[PDB]
Amino acid sequence: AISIKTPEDIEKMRVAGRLAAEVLEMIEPYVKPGVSTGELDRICNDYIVNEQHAVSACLGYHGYPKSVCISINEVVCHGIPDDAKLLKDGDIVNIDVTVIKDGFHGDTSKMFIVGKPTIMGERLCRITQESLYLALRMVKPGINLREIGAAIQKFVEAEGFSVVREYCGHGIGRGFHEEPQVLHYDSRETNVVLKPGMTFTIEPMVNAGKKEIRTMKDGWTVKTKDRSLSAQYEHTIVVTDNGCEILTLRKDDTIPAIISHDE
Ligand SMILES: COc1ccccc1-c1ccc(C(=O)O)o1
Ligand SMILES: [Mn+2]
Ligand SMILES: [Mn+2]
Ligand code: NA
């Protein structure tokens, strides 16, 4: 069921979480107009293997052929790095990373805007990160995941955007995806009360248009049914006695690593 990580295991999660976050901080300077997504993946894998001495949890997972997922514009998730796909000005791109180190997983992703940004692109990404942040500020013992899911949905929909229902956040530890499921919308099936020690991810997928998605015939690429833009941000966190601790925080994040709700 819902596992409570021991202090030792939480420390291992901090290490793994930091590594995942550092892959994103490392790749930043390379996300430029003209670069291929295949190249970005090789850079990430070489870094993960040769420098972090860790391993990508995506490589081989259900047969996935690459180390990280790179999704551009209308692609919602699981975009496959390809040497023929070049980034260009105005593109919004999500790079999703999951590394395993000392037996524990670190899971995180962020949006990158390539070259000259488009206003709609920046807005979609900003609102998506904001939906993740508001959810993070709600995490603390006693709160129900349903409340967080409902809050994310209300915020996103008020902005004229939609939340993807097919995918969700998840518990994480020695396993990539563990209990509980963390839906980013209201559901009567959700009734999970948070406890200190729980580690899970929050990773809303937000579409500028309709919520419906579609899977391409390559068996991996998921796109919006209406071809509207889609954005996602993800962080791995641990519930503490008075709130939570973000384990995959980056220099560019603008929310505190440790959130407290006590007086
Ligand atoms: C290889 O990527 C996947 C394939 C099947 C099911 C889930 C995934 C996946 C990619 C990223 C994540 C996640 O962040 O949870 O999960
Ligand atoms: Mn991920
Ligand atoms: Mn995840
Ligand atoms: Na996208």
Residue numbers in the entry: 2 to 264
From the paper:
Methionine aminopeptidase (MetAP) removes the N-terminal methionine residue from nascent proteins in all types of cells. MetAP is therefore a potential target for developing novel broad spectrum antibacterial drugs. E. coli MetAP is a typical bacterial MetAP, containing only a catalytic domain. A surface-exposed loop containing Y62, H63, G64 and Y65 (the YHGY loop) is an integral part of the active site pocket.
We report here five new X-ray crystal structures of the Mn(II)-form of E. coli MetAP, each complexed with a different inhibitor. All eight structures, including the five new ones, have the typical "pita-bread" fold found in other MetAP structures, and each of them contains two Mn(II) ions at the dinuclear metal site. A single molecule of inhibitor sits in the shallow active site pocket. Common features of the Mn(II)-form selective inhibitors 4–8 bound to E. coli MetAP in the five new structures are that all use their carboxylate group to coordinate with the two Mn(II) ions at the dinuclear metal site and all take a non-coplanar or twisted conformation for the two aromatic rings, consistent with our previously reported structures of E. coli MetAP complexed with 1–3. The twisted conformation found in all of the Mn(II)-form-selective inhibitors 1–8 is in agreement with the requirement of a hydrophobic ortho-substitution, such as chlorine, on the phenyl ring for inhibitory activity. The twist angles observed in the MetAP complexes of 1–8 range from the smallest 23.3° for 6 to the largest 52.9° for 4, suggesting that in general, the phenylfuran-based inhibitors dock into the active site in a conformation that may correspond to a minimum-energy solution conformation. The residues forming the dinuclear metal site (H171, D108, E204, E235 and D97), as well as the nearby residues S110, T202, F177, H178 and H79, show little change in position upon binding of any of these inhibitors. In contrast, residues Y62, H63, G64, and Y65 in the YHGY loop, as well as residue W221, moved significantly. The same is true for other inhibitors, and the loop show a great adaptability. This flexibility allows the binding pocket to adapt to different shapes of the bound inhibitors.
